[PDB]
Amino acid sequence: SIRVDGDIILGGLFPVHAKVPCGELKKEKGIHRLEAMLYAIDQINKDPDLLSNITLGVRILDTCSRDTYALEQSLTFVQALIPIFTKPDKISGVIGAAASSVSIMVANILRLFKIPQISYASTAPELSDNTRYDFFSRVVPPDSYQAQAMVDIVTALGWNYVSTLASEGNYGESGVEAFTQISREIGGVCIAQSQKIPREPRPGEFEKIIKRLLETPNARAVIMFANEDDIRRILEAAKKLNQSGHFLWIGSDSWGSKIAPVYQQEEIAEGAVTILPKRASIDGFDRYFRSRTLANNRRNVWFAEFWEENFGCKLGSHIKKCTGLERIARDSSYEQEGKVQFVIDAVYSMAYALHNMHKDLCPGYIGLCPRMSTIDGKELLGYIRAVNFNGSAGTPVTFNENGDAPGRYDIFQYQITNKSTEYKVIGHWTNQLHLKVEDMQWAHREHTHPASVCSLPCKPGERKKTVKGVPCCWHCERCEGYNYQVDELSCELCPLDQRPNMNRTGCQLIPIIKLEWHSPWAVVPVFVAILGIIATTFVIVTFVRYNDTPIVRASGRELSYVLLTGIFLCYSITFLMIAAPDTIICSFRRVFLGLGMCFSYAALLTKTNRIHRIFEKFISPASQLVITFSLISVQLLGVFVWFVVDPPHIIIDYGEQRTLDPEKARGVLKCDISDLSLICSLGYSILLMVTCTVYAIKTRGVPETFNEAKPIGFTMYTTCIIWLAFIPIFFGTAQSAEKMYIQTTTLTVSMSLSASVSLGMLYMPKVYII
Amino acid sequence: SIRVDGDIILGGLFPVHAKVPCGELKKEKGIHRLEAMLYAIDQINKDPDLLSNITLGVRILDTCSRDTYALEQSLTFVQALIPIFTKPDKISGVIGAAASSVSIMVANILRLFKIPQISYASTAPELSDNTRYDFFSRVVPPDSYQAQAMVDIVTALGWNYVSTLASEGNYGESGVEAFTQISREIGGVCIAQSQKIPREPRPGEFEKIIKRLLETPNARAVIMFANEDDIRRILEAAKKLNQSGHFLWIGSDSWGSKIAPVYQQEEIAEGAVTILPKRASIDGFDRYFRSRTLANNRRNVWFAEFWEENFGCKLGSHIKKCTGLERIARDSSYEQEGKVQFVIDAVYSMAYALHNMHKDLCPGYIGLCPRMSTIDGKELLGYIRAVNFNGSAGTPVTFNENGDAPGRYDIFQYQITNKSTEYKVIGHWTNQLHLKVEDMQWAHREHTHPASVCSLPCKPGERKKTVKGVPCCWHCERCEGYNYQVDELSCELCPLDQRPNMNRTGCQLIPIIKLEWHSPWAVVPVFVAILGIIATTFVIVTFVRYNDTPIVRASGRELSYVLLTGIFLCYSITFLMIAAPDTIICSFRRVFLGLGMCFSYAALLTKTNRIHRIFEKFISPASQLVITFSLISVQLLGVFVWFVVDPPHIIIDYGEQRTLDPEKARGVLKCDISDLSLICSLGYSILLMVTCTVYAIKTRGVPETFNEAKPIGFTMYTTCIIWLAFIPIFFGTAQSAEKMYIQTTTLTVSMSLSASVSLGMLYMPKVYII
Ligand SMILES: N[C@](CC1c2ccccc2Oc2ccccc21)(C(=O)O)[C@H]1C[C@@H]1C(=O)O
Ligand SMILES: N[C@](CC1c2ccccc2Oc2ccccc21)(C(=O)O)[C@H]1C[C@@H]1C(=O)O
């Protein structure tokens, strides 16, 4: 209870003593902060251009790290609303703070009474909502803003799969929850595990915690939000359990820049990312400390306790009279707190709020106005969250709509080297991230920056199926096969005319194979074909020169001409059916087939007709010319109408071959000549064969006549069986893979065999010598 | 501020005066309740076996329907924690209530200090959660328990589609929200509309509200939760807008049992469901009122104001000395409040809590114990919610875990009749619903109970598709067609052999139609068939008797026998192919077909063979017997192997007919005799025909011989064309719907025509007279 005059009175709650009130002068926490508050008030009342003639007053009470004691004191604040009675004060703002769950309770009791309250040290995420704390402002970063630093650094280093660790308190739980929530929304990071310790661990607990963190050897980032016991005991109990070089630690101030947690556990904590609230050094207030005497500070009720506990003398034991002694040399090691700047900033913000309210409510009139006499709570709260000023550090102090303060942290890193063991500054976090990546050193099992990704980007051509529920993880599967590889998750089929590339991705044309001119199957047919076209040509040459000569007289008639033409055409098609297929070749092959088949058989039938039926015009010229021209014209028109013969149209078997291995699958350059087309084409040939067979069965009972007409029948009979053998060897070739090879060989050889039989008893031995 | 002695002191907040404090003695609200509290305390201190020698004290303060004034008074409660100074009191419980937002604020300031608070009149749903009101108990039903009555009655009457109405306040909004929430979870009810009025309506607002409630003429239940202005103005502004007999009203106490809202708007509110908190009548406290003098009630600070405002005399104007006058006769119309029972119940509950705590904390020792000297807040709160007692009504008072009280309401109904205009009691709601349905009267446009269902259950066979998002609504679609009707939403196809029932649901066998024996298409073939079997039989009779007779000598040989047999068989199959199909009939038809076709044609060929080729064994017996027996045995084995002839197997065309109308669709009893089977069956007949044609073309150049052999050829030629005509009229019948009819007629008539041609020049005119 400190009474300082004033015209606008404020209040102050401070943690003098410790956890009704136990006796331990908390010193740094309490006394320092009281002196800071009174100091800042003292320079507020001197600045001529801050609040004009208005003066400030102060009502400083005590809290002993208890919630209820602070409740009684906050009741003491509000007592002007309830014979030498003195006028009570009128508090227009409360400026006090401590560990949380104290600011919470005073915030409730003060929001019930529309009194603003600005805190300097209370940093609890639960105190970050307008509901239930509409009147609570804060001039220090929330601890939830610390969880935005770990997320940013984890994203910056590329880690997406981490393991969180915490302690059972209101600190660890809230910090881990904020880390999880920021990890959500903005994605890119995943949490493998979340292990929370108890307040008191049973024997072996740390071993189980370590081994369950060691269960998944892919998450090697441990974001610890937990007090010193976890640090010390996890880093020491991992020595003989051998997780060294397997976990990288990122911790909050609970670890901080301290060296006490690990006295020698340095090889288990060879790397760390530590976040600390920024710090300053107030010069005028240190002077205030240095100028405080005993005859001056009668303003402090509990200041003799400071004299007794800061030097060890019980004035009321060294029993020293204590004379007069400045508190630097005769005092023990001296240092101030880091939170004095915030308790100065709070009172400055409140004074600025009052000044800004004066600017509007009471214009021009120096001092006060009756309108301004009552300091309305709502207007003051509105003006408090409207200040953008800077003081006592050179750094700005401002509040968002919630009333919190922007967070300014710094980041330290821990490594070792010969003679070097320190906490280098790798950067900071003031509404953004600033990391000196090249400054970081992880020189224990990781030469470059370490890795914690759940899965690793694969080679192209291996479809990566993201496992459901965890984008940070996936599993790669080969997409080899006829299907092409399009995207990371997309690989669909490429067209059958595109063999999939041997590069495990891409597609290319299938090679096309064709019956080759030089092959171990076509050489013997072309050879026998040319052998035939030599001997047959020789005989034809013999006949024509000697048409009138006896014995060859029957040969002189054009019947022999037509038979020879048919034989030569058969041989020609035998040769041509071998060479490489082309756009129009096969149509020519078909026309030649029709032509030769008509010629030879028509000659055979007309000769048989002339020979036999005449036993009951007969002359060779008349009969032959008519029938030959007629039948040739018939087949000529049959060819002309392009029903059996195909157009230049062809087929390429790019993908018709169904080989499981694309590589060895091939194709053929096949004219689209159907087997039914072949059968119907030779149908007229079959009819001629049937007619000639009937005629020669009639001849079988041959009249005496001559002897040259029986070989005609015999040769035709042999050719009948020779050609009938073809049909089974036409149908049976479809089963084999080399359908084209066997089909072409059998057709060509069967034609050559029929031709050679016609070259037999028909006209060879009759002219052995002519 | 009232001071009453005591050893355990309680507190009381009451609404004396009205909305710093304006001067209007609120009377019924304040004074009555103060007297009730002091009365209940007076009988608490007399009961020998309630709290033993412990005595109670009282601290009664005032609230003037303001939140802040109550805040100051609640500060006054807690002042024992902060030279003739007197010892302040120690309140161990607060017993006070008012309209809400006052109990809320005192509950906050008291939960900060672990002081129990039991309310008697504060009924706000927001005060129904352990969070922020852990120390607030209630001895009156929440208004949220009223929203459980409307839901129950709406479910009981069958309504599932209603329209909610509200007023812009903390009453209407919360009530409608609770109604919606209870409408969810347990389903069965839907809300068509939710219209909320403003605090001040612009001109025409009510017209727009009425017309938007009138937009959907299917929801005719209006659950109003709104104060009197809505009642009066909506019921009066609907007169000329003609929504009478279109909305049924269910309202809360804001309407209540009052008659002031509608002075004459009775035909727009001819029916109502009103919910009211239950009521009692305290007898001892009315006596307390009657026994209060002026020289006694010095215990009340504000009691002269009651004397002045309850009679009109300013003692300090009738300026009457006021003598001594009891407050019944010389006083104006006297009546008490309904909430006195609750303020008695609160103090009784607190005293019982203290007694129960004494039972455990201090055993056996009468008076007090040092352990029991401090009345811990947590233990007292635990014991408060452990009481199951009854008093001051005969009804029980108890608290759930939340601290609320069970709700006991009654339900009134408003109707009119000649000379009757009242609020009958249709039942109540005490943790359940009790409705006298037969007591309700809606005798204005609804003789029976009215209806508000969004959709109406349809007839079976009409699939009801529930509209998504609203189970209470659906749309019925006919499911006529071959698909059967299974369930309300399920109607799938029934088997093709089951015509869907004409009952719009069900399936039944399709009638099967067959070629009938008496038909306008089969009569002429069967008639010509029997005509043939008469004349042919007559000729056969003639031949056999006269085999040796000349002219008939050629007929004597069994060649004529075989021809006659063939003709008779043809006629027989002509007859049989008409009658109804059966299991095995068609196989017999096929065998007879083969037999007759073989017989007739074989005879024709063998006769032709005997006649012609012999110009270059010849005797009738030898030749005929061999060939006839051989060919008949051939066809006999052909039949025996059941390849062409089908087994007893048959087909029924239950659903093969594809008629869009199932009703007229039919089926046929068809043997599975394929057309290819017919063609291949007659193939041997075709071969015989071809052979005979060749033979008779050879005969055409007939030798002189005789003249009976040329009709053989001529008749065969005619039969050739007659039978060849059948094939086009065999193939062309498939297009027509009556495929069976035309096919059977053409086959049978073609057979009869061929038979009649064989009955022509073969053997008829050669025996004109024998
Ligand atoms: N920021 C503090 C302390 C903060 C903390 C906050 C909430 C709960 C636990 C908790 O424990 C730790 C442990 C290590 C580092 C910081 C904290 C606050 O209580 O708000 C504030 C008391 C500190 C001060 O007054 O100097
Ligand atoms: N039940 C009351 C009143 C209830 C209500 C509750 C909440 C908000 C508004 C509100 O206004 C209406 C209007 C008409 C009927 C009942 C209420 C409570 O305040 O809880 C309480 C005042 C009653 C009393 O003190 O006798």
Helices (H), ranges, A271-363:
283-291, 304-311, 340-361
Q: Are A128 and A144 in contact (CB under 8 A)?
A: yes
Dihedral sign from CA coordinates of A525, A530, A535, A540: positive
Pick the closest to residue B137 from B176, B170, B106, B171 (CA basis). Answer: B106
Cα–Cα distance measured from residue A360 to residue A366, given in angstroms and rounded to the nearest whole number = 13
Q: Do A72 and B79 touch (CB under 8 A)?
A: no
A75–chain B Cβ distance below 8 A for any pair: yes
Q: Name the architecture of domain A2-138+281-301+336-394.
A: 3-Layer(aba) Sandwich (3.40)
Between helices A205-213 and A228-237, what is the axis angle to 10°?
80
Cα–Cα distance measured from residue B179 to residue B582, given in angstroms and rounded to the nearest whole number = 74
Residues of A in Cβ contact (< 8 Å) with B76: 82
Q: How far, in Å, from the CA of B145 to the mean position of ligand 2?
A: 14
Cα–Cα distance measured from residue A590 to residue A381, given in angstroms and rounded to the nearest whole number = 104
Phi-psi region of B359 (alpha: psi -120 to 50; beta: other; left: phi over 0): alpha
| Chain A interface test: which of B75, B126, B133, B134 (most A C-beta within 10 Å) | B75
In chain B, ranges of CATH 1.20.1070.10 domains: 523-767
The conformation of residue B645, written as its DSSP 8-state character, comes to S
| CATH among 3.40.1800.10, 3.40.50.2300, 3.10.20.30, 3.40.50.300 for B2-140+339-397 | 3.40.50.2300
Q: Residue A272 forms beta bridges with which residues?
A: A249
Tokens of B466: 């529930």
Q: Do B82 and A75 touch (CB under 8 A)?
A: yes
Residue type, A472: C
Pick the closest to residue A635 from A582, A569, A694 (CA basis). Answer: A569
In chain A, ranges of CATH 2.10.50.30 domains: 458-510
Three-class DSSP labels, B64-111? CCCHHHHHHHHHHHCCCCCCCCCCCCCEEEEECCCCCCCHHHHHHHHH
Q: How many CA atoms lie within 13 A of A666 on its CB side?
A: 11
Q: How far, in Å, from the CA of A402 to the mean position of ligand 1?
A: 20
Residues 6+ away with beta carbon under 8 Å from A667: A510, A511, A512, A513, A652, A653, A654, A655, A656, A657
Q: How far, in Å, from the CA of A149 to the mean position of ligand 1?
A: 18
A110–chain B Cβ distance below 8 A for any pair: no
A113–chain B Cβ distance below 8 A for any pair: yes
Q: Give the residue from chain B lying closest to A84, CA to CA.
A: B83
In chain B, ranges of CATH 3.40.50.2300 domains: 2-140+339-397, 143-279+409-439
Q: Is A394 exposed, middle or buried (0-12, 13-18, 19+ CB in 10 A)?
A: exposed
End-to-end CA separation in angstroms for chain B? 156
In chain A, ranges of CATH 1.20.1070.10 domains: 523-653+666-767
Q: Do B78 and A75 touch (CB under 8 A)?
A: yes
A451–chain B Cβ distance below 8 A for any pair: no
Q: Do A113 and B71 touch (CB under 8 A)?
A: yes
Q: For atom 5 of ligand 2, which residue has the closest CA? A: B171
Q: How far is B702 from chain A (nearest CA, A)?
A: 20
Angstrom resolution of this structure: 3.2
Q: Are B453 and B161 in contact (CB under 8 A)?
A: yes
Q: Which of the listed residues B26, B27, B29, B100 should we mutate to test ligand 2's pocket, taking the one with most ligand atoms within 8 A of CB?
A: B100
Q: How far, in Å, from the CA of B123 to the mean position of ligand 2?
A: 7
Measured in whole angstroms, how far is the alpha carbon of residue A501 from the centre of its chain? 24
For residue B196, say whether it is annotated as part of any ligand binding site. no
Is B164 strand, coil or helix? strand
Q: Cα dist. A757→A692, A751, A764 in Å? A: 16, 10, 11
Q: For atom 14 of ligand 2, which residue has the closest CA? A: B254
Query: For the domain A458-510, what is the CATH code?
Result: 2.10.50.30
Range list of β-strands (E), B406-456: 408-417, 420-430, 433-435
Q: Name the architecture of domain A523-653+666-767.
A: Up-down Bundle (1.20)
Q: Is B515 exposed, middle or buried (0-12, 13-18, 19+ CB in 10 A)?
A: buried
Cα–Cα distance measured from residue A335 to residue A279, given in angstroms and rounded to the nearest whole number = 13
> Could you tell me what percentage of chain B is helix, strand and coil, using 3-state DSSP and rounding each to the nearest 5?
40, 15, 45
Residues 6+ away with beta carbon under 8 Å from A677: A644, A646
Q: How far, in Å, from the CA of B99 to the mean position of ligand 2?
A: 6
Q: Residue B117 forms beta bridges with which residues?
A: B94, B136
Residues 6+ away with beta carbon under 8 Å from B230: B165, B167, B197, B224
Tokens of B40: 């209940």
Cα–Cα distance measured from residue B476 to residue A478, given in angstroms and rounded to the nearest whole number = 52
For residue A353, say whether it is annotated as part of any ligand binding site. no
- Reported residue count of chain A is 770
| Chain B interface test: which of A112, A133, A376 (most B C-beta within 10 Å) | A112
Query: For the domain B143-279+409-439, what is the CATH code?
Result: 3.40.50.2300
Q: Are B36 and B85 in contact (CB under 8 A)?
A: no
Residues of A in Cβ contact (< 8 Å) with B113: 71
In chain A, ranges of CATH 3.40.50.2300 domains: 2-138+281-301+336-394, 143-279+409-439
Q: Are B92 and B375 in contact (CB under 8 A)?
A: yes
- The pairs formed by B187-191 with CB atoms below 8 angstroms and a separation of 24 or more are B187/B471, B188/B155, B188/B160, B188/B472, B189/B151, B189/B154, B189/B155, B189/B159, B189/B160, B189/B161, B189/B162, B189/B472, B190/B160, B190/B161, B190/B162, B190/B454, B190/B470, B190/B471, B190/B472, B190/B473, B191/B162, B191/B163, B191/B164
Residues 6+ away with beta carbon under 8 Å from B51: B44, B351, B354, B355, B358
Q: Residue A224 forms beta bridges with which residues?
A: A165, A251
The conformation of residue A551, written as its DSSP 8-state character, comes to T
The torsion of the CA quartet A670, A675, A680, A685, rounded to 10 degrees, works out to: 90
Q: Give the residue from chain A lying closest to B75, CA to CA.
A: A82
Q: How far is B696 from chain A (nearest CA, A)?
A: 20
Q: Is A59 exposed, middle or buried (0-12, 13-18, 19+ CB in 10 A)?
A: buried
Closest ligand by atom to B231 CA: 2
- CATH fold of B523-767, please? Rhopdopsin 7-helix transmembrane proteins (1.20.1070)
Cα–Cα distance measured from residue B428 to residue B392, given in angstroms and rounded to the nearest whole number = 21
Residues of B in Cβ contact (< 8 Å) with A78: 75
Cα–Cα distance measured from residue B743 to residue B636, given in angstroms and rounded to the nearest whole number = 26
Measured in whole angstroms, how far is the alpha carbon of residue B206 from the centre of its chain? 36
Tokens 């005769």 map to which residue?
Answer: A330
The conformation of residue A512, written as its DSSP 8-state character, comes to B
Q: Do A82 and B76 touch (CB under 8 A)?
A: yes
Q: Do B112 and A75 touch (CB under 8 A)?
A: no
Residues of B in Cβ contact (< 8 Å) with A113: 71
